[PDB]
From a paper:
For both the cytoplasmic and periplasmic domains of PrgH, we applied a 24-mer oligomerization constraint, according to the established stoichiometry. For the cytoplasmic domain of PrgH, we observed that mutation of two leucine residues to alanine or an electronegative glutamate (Leu20 and Leu87) abrogates secretion, while a more conservative mutation to tyrosine has no effect (bottom). Negative stain EM analysis demonstrates that despite being necessary for secretion the PrgH cytoplasmic domain, as observed in a PrgH130–392 mutant (lacking the N-terminal cytoplasmic domain), is not required for assembly of the basal body. Protein sequence alignment of the PrgH orthologues indeed illustrates that the conserved residues involved in phosphopeptide binding in FHA domains are poorly conserved. To validate this, we engineered mutations of the PrgH residues corresponding to the proposed phosphothreonine interacting residues in MxiG - Arg35, Gln42 and Asp65 - to alanine. These mutations have no effect on in vivo secretion assays. We therefore conclude that the PrgH cytoplasmic domain is unlikely to interact with pThr-modified proteins. We note however that the FHA phosphopeptide interacting loops in our PrgH structure are accessible on the cytoplasmic face of the ring model, suggesting a potential interface for protein-protein interactions. Indeed, deletion of this domain results in the formation of secretion incompetent immature basal body assemblies lacking needles suggesting a role in the correct assembly/coordination of the inner-membrane export apparatus.
Residue numbers in the entry:
A (entry chain X), B (entry chain A), C (entry chain B), D (entry chain C): 14 to 119
Amino acid sequence: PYIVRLLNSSLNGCEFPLLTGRTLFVVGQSDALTASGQLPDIPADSFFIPLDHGGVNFEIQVDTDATEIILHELKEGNSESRSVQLNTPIQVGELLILIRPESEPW
Amino acid sequence: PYIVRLLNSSLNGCEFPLLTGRTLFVVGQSDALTASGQLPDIPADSFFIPLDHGGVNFEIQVDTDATEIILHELKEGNSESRSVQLNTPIQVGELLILIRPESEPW
Amino acid sequence: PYIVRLLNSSLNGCEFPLLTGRTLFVVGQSDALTASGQLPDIPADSFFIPLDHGGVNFEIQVDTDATEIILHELKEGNSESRSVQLNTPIQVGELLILIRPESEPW
Amino acid sequence: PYIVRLLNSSLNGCEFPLLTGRTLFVVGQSDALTASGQLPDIPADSFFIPLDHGGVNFEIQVDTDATEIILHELKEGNSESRSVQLNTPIQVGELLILIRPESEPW
């Protein structure tokens, strides 16, 4: 299984497990934060990351084979996708994240 | 495992264990101090160091192999990295620190 | 292990054990005295010495090999170091101290 | 072990044991007397001797070998030392003292 580690922001060092399938990361201010509590905490498929500006919401898709990891950067009325690699800084908006195997600490 | 020892500041002689991965050191005044209590004390990945001026926040990254230690000096909108050596004074801003093996007292 | 003995001041004859590593001596008036109580009394790495004038803060560094003893005299924005010898008067500011082995009374 | 015996003053005949190392004798008026009670009575390394004028503070240093006895006469910003002999009147300021072995009464 894979883990998203924040490399910057006020939550630098936070690590969020990923579930097979798609996981949403809402990145922004308190308006999004307080509005994100409307969905249950069942096997988390979404997370909120505070970021004072330049935040961009994104989704990380992990296939059932776990041989490819796609990151969907969400934009107005659309999304853009890219393939990402493990153990390397990934910049989404002003947020810097790293996706690692659970067994390979960063 | 490695330990950060402060060589100056009002906490001179304080020693902070490092965990595999990244550890944040917030260095500054009371605004940062009282605002740093918003995150839990779970296996500490962050520390606050008081310093009346010239403080610079930084991160110490310890690889899982423990064969290289990187120090990321945080700057506005960016960070600068450098490799550091054990048992030698390291200057970050006006702060002077030393990174040592747990078994090698300074 | 080594012991610092004061040879002058109002605490003349006081003896302070040294721990492997660095020990801070704050030397000055009551402003420093009452402000020095903000850190815990865990294995003391700091001490306060009253001195009506000419006091200078310093650190005594004892290596893990105990084959060299360095005294860091603290100055504004910097420190100066010197190697010191056992069983001899050492002048730091107006303070006169002596560093002796625990087994060799002065 | 050695003993200091006062040969004059209002405490004439008082005998004060000496400990290996340095012992302080504060000699003066009531200002010094009432200010001398700020240190604990642990293995005494200091004593107060009343003397209406000409009092001079001094220290008696007894080496661990007990083969030499040094008397440090304290002066402003400095001290002067001299070697003293057992069983003979020693004048410090207007105070007259005698240092004797514990087994040799005066």
